[PDB]
Amino acid sequence: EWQENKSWNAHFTEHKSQGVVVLWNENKQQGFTNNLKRANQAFLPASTLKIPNSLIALDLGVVKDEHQVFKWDGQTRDIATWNRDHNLITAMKYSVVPVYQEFARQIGEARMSKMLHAFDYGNEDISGNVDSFWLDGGIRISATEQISFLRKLYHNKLHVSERSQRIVKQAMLTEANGDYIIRAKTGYSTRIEPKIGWWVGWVELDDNVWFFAMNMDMPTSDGLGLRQAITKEVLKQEKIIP
Amino acid sequence: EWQENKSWNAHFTEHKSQGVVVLWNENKQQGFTNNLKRANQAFLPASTLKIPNSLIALDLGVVKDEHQVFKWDGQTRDIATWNRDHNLITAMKYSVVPVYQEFARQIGEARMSKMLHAFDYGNEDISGNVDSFWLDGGIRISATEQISFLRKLYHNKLHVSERSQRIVKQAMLTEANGDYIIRAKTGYSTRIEPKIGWWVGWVELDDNVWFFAMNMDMPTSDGLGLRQAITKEVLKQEKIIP
Ligand SMILES: [Cl-]
């Protein structure tokens, strides 16, 4: 059963923002959120789509492994970290659109769409075009749908090989210490109103896993750090992390 | 190739300690240590043996996956984290000897030596006999030999399945942040003099990986934190980590 907890709103209020955090306790099969309505609002995935994109690239052998280097094409771009060679680990880490655009062109439009459908990943909206779709059809996904997808990935239940899912979860590694491990992917949807920032993944504990998906209004990039900040604030409140 | 950097001795000296740090630059295929003689001294591996032990258990089906629970046997031991159910992840995190003894029980001495020999992990295995011979399956291994075995694991070149090696590499996840990822295993050999503490593994960077292996005289359990602290001071000094 889903349970709503407005007390989390204070963490959004504090930084003068608007959003939703969704948490799923895997042991208890119970969800929590500050807003069930927006928890179920579908938005563009932005770079959270790189999780299934990576699964598909690995499963088709377009990416051999997390070590294969994809060379910089020489065009310089506004994100300095993109102007360098990358492997799957660092392409995830820095959300390198040109690397993923080259994956997408090797995979194929139609296969991409089919294989995202096989994931139950958001809802139809299939164009376009090749490799960056939305415009006459952009997959949208709600935060709870992100949890549902992430749960299958965690349990290796998706319609791709087990190796593919293992390597993507390695590449999603964001933080680890003696208390918790976070595997997650950020996203920032700018090219259609309303601008929103994403953070989706899970926290592994010794004896439990907490899946989370959050999105929030992001009129400018000044607030991007708040994606992790507000999430951790909520994770601290619910005593998931210290 | 193998440079001796005696300026690292200051990091043991600082703590009135005695030991060796070994580093391997994977990109440059070049190694560094403060003591070439100690770097090649074979010690009992203690809990660093749990890295190859885990590979063997997975490859044989003794451990089905990283989620299989291994129930506590009801006998309380001195270390509180041992007195609970464990899976592969938490067993390695707290170095739970009763769990690994049950792995060894199912593997048997004979297969353990065949496989350790196939890994070229240290020297002697089952044939270990006479004088002090019952410990750590008769293995003695040096810090440079730890590096050799870790490099094979990193590259999935050991003679067990790729899946086995990927699962074990997940299980050694110790620390991760925006600057690096450490995969490693501690060890503390106490049943034979001189007592020594181990820390072995590697540091993943965007663009390189640095393998490390350190051991150090450890009279009392008081100074086990020095294993990581001295290592990190070498890593900081060499500008591997901030
Ligand atoms: Cl990992």
Side-chain angles (χ1 to χ4, degrees), chain A residues 2-129 131-242, chain B:
Chain A
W2 288 100
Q3 143 166 7
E4 182 180 274
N5 190 340
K6 323 247 186 306
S7 39
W8 302 352
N9 282 331
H11 309 114
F12 283 114
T13 279
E14 271 157 74
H15 302 276
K16 220 102 63 193
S17 63
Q18 293 246 327
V20 61
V21 171
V22 184
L23 299 185
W24 179 264
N25 179 324
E26 183 64 2
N27 280 350
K28 309 174 172 283
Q29 295 288 104
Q30 213 144 36
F32 312 88
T33 184
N34 65 335
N35 181 349
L36 316 86
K37 211 175 82 223
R38 185 182 175 134
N40 291 287
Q41 210 186 323
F43 306 96
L44 298 181
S47 286
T48 75
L49 191 67
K50 295 179 163 65
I51 297 171
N53 286 348
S54 299
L55 290 173
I56 294 165
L58 287 156
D59 210 64
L60 292 173
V62 172
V63 174
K64 190 206 262 323
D65 56 34
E66 75 272 27
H67 306 312
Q68 179 171 11
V69 177
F70 299 96
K71 289 200 317 142
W72 180 50
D73 53 11
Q75 169 175 335
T76 72
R77 281 146 168 120
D78 292 335
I79 316 287
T81 51
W82 297 8
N83 301 319
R84 70 182 51 146
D85 299 336
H86 285 290
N87 57 36
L88 191 72
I89 310 298
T90 62
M92 272 308 258
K93 193 212 193 139
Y94 300 114
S95 207
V96 187
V97 159
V99 170
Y100 277 83
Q101 274 169 349
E102 174 83 12
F103 296 166
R105 286 197 298 281
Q106 284 185 243
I107 309 187
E109 267 207 86
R111 312 215 267 202
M112 197 46 84
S113 282
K114 314 219 165 153
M115 287 176 87
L116 297 173
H117 202 71
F119 290 162
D120 197 22
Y121 186 88
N123 282 100
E124 197 211 322
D125 263 335
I126 96 184
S127 72
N129 234 321
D131 89 319
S132 99
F133 69 98
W134 185 213
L135 180 70
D136 295 349
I139 290 175
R140 305 201 146 51
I141 192 167
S142 74
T144 57
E145 285 166 347
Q146 295 258 24
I147 299 288
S148 276
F149 169 75
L150 286 163
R151 277 169 83 230
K152 296 171 170 100
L153 179 56
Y154 178 89
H155 292 300
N156 295 324
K157 283 281 158 274
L158 291 168
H159 202 232
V160 279
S161 70
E162 176 187 309
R163 171 178 180 277
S164 288
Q165 296 171 92
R166 284 187 180 285
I167 291 173
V168 171
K169 288 182 277 190
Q170 178 184 352
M172 292 176 42
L173 178 55
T174 299
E175 192 176 1
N177 58 36
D179 295 312
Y180 62 76
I181 299 162
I182 290 171
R183 303 185 189 282
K185 181 69 193 92
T186 57
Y188 182 26
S189 185
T190 58
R191 72 73 187 260
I192 281 280
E193 298 303 302
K195 310 206 173 53
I196 70 136
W198 281 104
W199 203 33
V200 309
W202 58 80
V203 184
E204 305 177 7
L205 306 179
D206 291 350
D207 313 287
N208 204 2
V209 178
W210 283 86
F211 294 85
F212 68 82
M214 84 79 89
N215 57 64
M216 81 187 172
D217 294 346
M218 194 69 55
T220 77
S221 59
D222 285 352
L224 283 163
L226 299 174
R227 292 167 305 175
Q228 298 97 331
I230 292 165
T231 304
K232 284 184 160 180
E233 262 329 276
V234 166
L235 292 178
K236 280 171 198 255
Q237 185 189 320
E238 293 287 305
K239 330 254 207 151
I240 290 154
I241 64 172
Chain B
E1 246 43 29
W2 265 120
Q3 227 153 315
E4 211 178 58
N5 203 322
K6 282 207 145 213
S7 94
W8 298 353
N9 280 338
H11 297 305
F12 292 91
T13 278
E14 174 147 271
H15 306 90
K16 267 144 217 152
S17 316
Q18 267 261 108
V20 70
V21 175
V22 176
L23 298 184
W24 184 266
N25 183 328
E26 183 64 0
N27 272 3
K28 266 84 74 194
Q29 299 280 324
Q30 165 75 222
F32 302 96
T33 179
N34 65 306
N35 187 340
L36 155 53
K37 188 144 153 113
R38 189 170 175 141
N40 288 296
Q41 202 190 341
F43 301 101
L44 281 161
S47 288
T48 70
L49 184 58
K50 294 182 171 61
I51 298 172
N53 276 349
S54 298
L55 291 168
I56 295 163
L58 284 157
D59 203 73
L60 285 188
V62 170
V63 174
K64 184 184 92 283
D65 64 27
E66 73 270 24
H67 300 299
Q68 178 169 8
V69 180
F70 292 101
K71 276 241 177 219
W72 172 55
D73 72 354
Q75 203 202 300
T76 88
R77 275 121 182 138
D78 282 345
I79 311 82
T81 52
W82 292 15
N83 302 320
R84 74 182 58 152
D85 296 3
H86 281 288
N87 58 39
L88 189 60
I89 305 297
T90 57
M92 183 175 293
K93 175 179 183 182
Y94 301 111
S95 196
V96 184
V97 160
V99 176
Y100 275 83
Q101 302 230 259
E102 177 70 17
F103 298 167
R105 224 212 68 230
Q106 253 187 278
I107 284 140
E109 288 184 32
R111 316 199 263 176
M112 194 75 89
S113 299
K114 229 187 90 153
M115 305 228 57
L116 291 187
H117 187 78
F119 294 165
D120 196 24
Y121 184 85
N123 289 278
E124 250 175 321
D125 305 283
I126 293 322
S127 312
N129 173 77
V130 300
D131 279 322
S132 248
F133 86 77
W134 45 104
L135 301 171
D136 290 328
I139 291 289
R140 312 281 272 241
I141 188 169
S142 69
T144 66
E145 287 164 355
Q146 296 261 24
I147 298 287
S148 282
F149 165 72
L150 293 165
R151 290 182 66 241
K152 293 169 173 102
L153 175 56
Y154 177 88
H155 291 299
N156 298 324
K157 288 318 74 183
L158 291 164
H159 288 74
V160 285
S161 64
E162 181 186 315
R163 169 172 183 281
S164 288
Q165 291 169 88
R166 284 185 180 284
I167 289 174
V168 167
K169 285 184 277 187
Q170 174 182 355
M172 325 145 60
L173 179 56
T174 297
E175 192 181 3
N177 61 33
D179 296 316
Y180 59 83
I181 298 161
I182 289 174
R183 300 184 188 284
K185 181 72 195 82
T186 50
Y188 184 21
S189 179
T190 77
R191 299 196 182 183
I192 280 161
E193 284 293 297
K195 308 198 227 263
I196 76 142
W198 280 103
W199 202 34
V200 310
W202 60 78
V203 182
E204 305 176 4
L205 307 182
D206 287 347
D207 68 293
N208 201 183
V209 47
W210 283 87
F211 298 86
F212 68 82
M214 80 85 45
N215 59 69
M216 103 165 277
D217 298 349
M218 197 54 45
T220 165
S221 59
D222 278 10
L224 313 170
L226 297 179
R227 292 170 304 175
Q228 292 97 336
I230 288 166
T231 309
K232 288 174 128 212
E233 285 304 307
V234 169
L235 292 177
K236 284 163 187 291
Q237 169 179 343
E238 297 311 307
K239 280 107 160 60
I240 292 155
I241 60 174

